[PDB]
Design a protein around this ligand. Structure first.
Ligand SMILES: CCCS(=O)(=O)Nc1ccc(F)c(-n2cc(-c3cncnc3)c3nc(N(C)C4CCN(C(C)=O)CC4)ccc32)c1F
Ligand SMILES: CCCS(=O)(=O)Nc1ccc(F)c(-n2cc(-c3cncnc3)c3nc(N(C)C4CCN(C(C)=O)CC4)ccc32)c1F
Lengths: 254, 252
């Protein structure tokens, strides 16, 4: 899928540098300013290999990768903004039907990812793009420092090996996104302190209150959302059941 | 080779077409499954090669191939799009489309065809019925999937022609432009299959450009006529067509 250098035309810039380019129509190319790094080259190869096996309407359409001018990924161009900008920044009055439709499409995309054992580690409402309208597209998804291995303390050695991301973190992020959709605001809106939220969520003391959900939201949706926010990882359900429940609730509520 | 959807995962539904029988199925959301009346290894290798041809297509304006199934029946599974075919919009429904929407549909089809030809892919059955309008303004294109020594010089010449090429595709694109601008199928007066076949084969008949809408620009009609050249070599290449269409869209 390597696109030659001369074929790709660069355009306006809108981590990593993103630019809206023109290549057989509108595309978006993300390149990193480097002149690169072999470690970054291996990471780019792994990211390209992960992105190549993805074909779904609700997943962003990867179109190619370029390596000659700068290590870069070229995908389709979609008109609109992120769900974070729609709900939080503009506070657009979204009908409950549009909310449950966005939820169903996000669930389709996540079920597709998990069916391929692909782990979207940074799933958030800011990485959920709304092409046109009511069309969801998802994107923006080992001690390398070999020399300083001996001098680091057991505090930092143990931290580098940790691998917390799994399907359960993804379903928790999906539940938080459902909270954003239904309430219309970021969770823990009162607590404007990062450290407090981090500590209270790490100790499981704080969870987003489902009481602030909009009155138009059905009860089954809130039940599924609360089920996805289980503190214990194993209690959280798998995404096929989530998609089935969302589709059933949408069919019931027309 | 690694895109086969296993059996039982795909749930079939109502038939929405009957090249191949089309059905709206459910597999990680709404999908569309096209099935073939055919299980033989010789045919299986050809199906695998066709799948490999379909795998090198990733474009917003090209229909999204999502997988192939061989266990219950040999079938191709792609995305599901809400809407109808451009043929249904213009001819069957006669939806009042603004000239901006028409030139945008033309630009999207041109992007898709230029991408296909850039991959050295020859869409042999290009027609306005294979252009689906997802939502109501997103174009999706699909339906594009020896005894030589013993043959006499009379019959050998027929094999050497190879009539399908990029020029046939740009001719079909010109016919699609005619449908877009006029709003009706070409040769509406004749309505005879054999007569039209003969007269177009001898180059005696061309779609009458007088029935074109008044709103259509002159550059668009010029490009359309350039794509309908009887001689294959006179027809322009799709990159130049895409550039001209983009410039005309920016101007208007
Ligand atoms: C299947 C591949 C997933 S991926 O994990 O490989 N990630 C990825 C790769 C390449 C990309 F270009 C973008 N990307 C595109 C837009 C974009 C914005 N507006 C209109 N069209 C597109 C954008 N906007 C941002 N802000 C940030 C990143 C953006 C990617 F997310
Ligand atoms: C992607 C690689 C290219 S491919 O060469 O491999 N070919 C291929 C492979 C697999 C496929 F499923 C379809 N295919 C999908 C829909 C589809 C339908 N509805 C929503 N989304 C998609 C569809 N519709 C079709 N017809 C009959 C039209 C005609 C008129 N209509 C009216 C009057 O209403 C509606 C529909 C025909 C084929 C269709 C393929 F073209």
């Amino acid at each position: 899928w390597e696109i030659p250098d001369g074929q790709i035309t660069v355009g306006q810039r809108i981590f990593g540098t993103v630019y809206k380019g023109k290549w057989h129509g509108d595309v978006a190319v993300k390149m990193l300013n480097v002149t690169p790094t072999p470690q970054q080259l291996q990471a780019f190869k792994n990211e390209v290999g992960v992105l190549r096996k993805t074909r779904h309407v609700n997943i962003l359409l990867f179109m190619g990768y370029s390596t000659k001018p700068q290590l870069a990924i070229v995908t389709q161009w979609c008109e609109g903004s992120s769900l974070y900008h729609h709900l939080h920044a503009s506070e657009t009055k979204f009908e409950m039907k549009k909310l449950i439709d966005i939820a169903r499409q996000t669930a389709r995309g996540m079920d597709y990812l998990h069916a391929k054992s692909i782990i979207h580690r940074d799933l958030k409402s800011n990485n959920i793009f709304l092409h046109e309208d009511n069309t969801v597209k998802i994107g923006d998804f080992f001690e390398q420092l070999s020399g300083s291995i001996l001098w680091m303390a057991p505090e930092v050695i143990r931290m580098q090996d940790s691998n917390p991301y799994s399907f359960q973190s993804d379903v928790y992020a999906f539940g938080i996104v459902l909270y954003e959709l239904m309430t219309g605001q970021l969770p823990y809106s009162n607590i404007n302190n990062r450290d407090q939220i981090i500590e209270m969520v790490g100790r499981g003391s704080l969870s987003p209150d489902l009481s602030k959900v909009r009155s138009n939201c059905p009860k089954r949706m809130k039940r599924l959302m609360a089920e996805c926010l289980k503190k214990k990882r194993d209690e959280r359900p798998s995404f096929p059941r989530i998609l089935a429940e969302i589709e059933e609730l949408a069919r019931e509520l027309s």
